[PDB]
Amino acid sequence: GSSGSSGTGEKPYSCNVCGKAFVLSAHLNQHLRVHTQETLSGPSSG
């Protein structure tokens, strides 16, 4: 169990916050929200 999940052609968009990926930009933005949101859970992006 050394290698992760085998795949081809890594998505251009990636969530550099928690650890996600997306094919398009709009998809990534929708996600980033969960991070760029005012809450008392953890460190925000801004």
Task: Summarize as ranges the residues that interact with Zn ion (CB under 5 A).
Answer: 15, 17-18, 20
**Nearer to Zn ion (CB atom), residue 17 or residue 27:** 17
Residue 3 CB coordination number (10 Å): 5
**Of residues 1 and 46, the one with the C-beta less far from Zn ion:** 46
Name which of 1 and 33 has its Cβ closer to Zn ion.
33
Q: Using CA atoms, how far apart are residues 11 and 14, in angstroms rounded to an integer?
A: 7
Residue 6's identity, in one-letter code, is S
| Cβ at position 34, least distance to Zn ion in Å | 6
Residue owning tokens 């169990």? 1
